[model samples]
Target: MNIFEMLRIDEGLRLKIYKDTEGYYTIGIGHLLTKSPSLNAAKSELDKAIGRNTNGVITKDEAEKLFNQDVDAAVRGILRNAKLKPVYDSLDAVRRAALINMVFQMGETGIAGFTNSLRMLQQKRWDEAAVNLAKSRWYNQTPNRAKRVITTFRTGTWDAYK
Candidate 1:
């Protein structure tokens, strides 16, 4: 019912900073230092957020605020710079959500590096885009995640891998 609930469902609430699936230090849903962020800078910000050192924790409300700010910047970045901007916008909400998720996890610059996939998407070749996504280094690095993204791109299903 609440926006927080929606984000929590997708991101899973985490009160503490921990290693994510990719082994990066993450906190509060998925906040990081900004994809290999400087340790001191991140630690300073984390300290401010939790009102203590890096070992500190946050409440659900704090996580929710961080999540909203993150997603807001994420959407703006993707919309502004994704190679297939128009194609991404043309997709239905669910498909667009998947793109946002990808950008969220990979960072807009990383996702933008998917040149083949982006080209396929820009050409409106959904299947090719899916296949290209599956064939990329990103896929080999994270097969399970790549499968979900490829499936979503190919099928237009919100929870394709689920």
Candidate 2:
């Protein structure tokens, strides 16, 4: 599956605002409203995307739009990181999607903190990379998703998603 599909499954669609696992105000497939410039800006953008005042709710289509934007931002953010660029470039599609999924959930800076894991990934050391990722609090906090991503990294295939 593609990054969007994988993320839809991992993040889940939420038309209304809800507290995420970390207790941040999030909506629409893990869109972090707490990170927006302002709640008003977020509301305005949601309203615009939904073609009306949503009153704190959005349609699936509107949610999908936000998801698309967020994924695009995550991809660009990853590519913009000098340290991540080469590692990102050396990976295949499934592996690339796995990295994008991590970035989508944790932000590029968060993924960049995986220095050893990134090094292993750059070297195509799948087992080492998977092991490094499993050692993170991220794995403890979201074991199922973490396992899937780790498997993706380990196998370089879409079997985890399946």
Candidate 3:
């Protein structure tokens, strides 16, 4: 059987929202309704099936049709934020990559809110920005990632967290 056929058999086609065998909200083939449906812009199109009252299911072909989209949104967001511009653009490629990752993770809106950190970055105060980054909620939530981002900002060395 082709891969599509295999996924169809394994995941099953369901038009209606139902708890799967393991008990998670699922519909339209085997698409699991998890967080961040917006990740690839697939959710906006896929989720259209959600509010209907009639029982429904989509074909494996239809399920396969959905795709995640828009990394550019993340990149565009980083580029658009004035506060992040100097820090984001002035950094070397590796440091820029790290900051890009951070921007994608927290979002440009999130980056914009890092007032103190942005100020420190604007002033070219690397140590202060790094320290403030470590002090943020974003840092506490993902310490390992924070370490990597902060290290990148401070030293301009990629993968210094190791």
Question: Against the true structure, whose lDDT is highest?
Answer: 2
lDDT of each: 0.69, 0.87, 0.59
Per-prediction backbone clash count? 0, 0, 6
* Residues 1-162, model 2: lDDT tens digits: 799989999999888877788876678998887755466766765576567988879888888888889999989988999988898999999999999999999987777679999999999999988988999999999999999999999999889887
Candidate 2: Cα lDDT at 158: 87
Off by over 4 Å in 1: 1-11, 34-42, 49-55, 82-84
Clashing pairs in 3: 14-57, 15-56, 15-57, 16-56, 40-68, 40-69
Task: Write model 1 residue lDDT over 12-111, tens digit each, in one string.
Answer: 7788776566666678887874335455555667887666565547778877788988888878887787474775777776667667777877887777
Select the stronger candidate by TM-score from 1 and 2: 2
Measured by TM-score, the strongest candidate is 2
Q: Could you give the candidate ranking by TM-score, starting with the highest?
A: 2, 1, 3
Alpha-carbon RMSD to native, per candidate: 3.4, 2.5, 10.2
| Candidate 2, run of 10 with poorest lDDT | 35-44
Model 3 ranges off by over 4 Å: 1-69
- Model 1 scores worst on lDDT over the 10 consecutive residues at 1-10
| 80-153 per-residue lDDT for model 3 (tens digits) | 77777777777667566666666645567777668888777657788988988888777886676577668877
lDDT of 3: 0.59
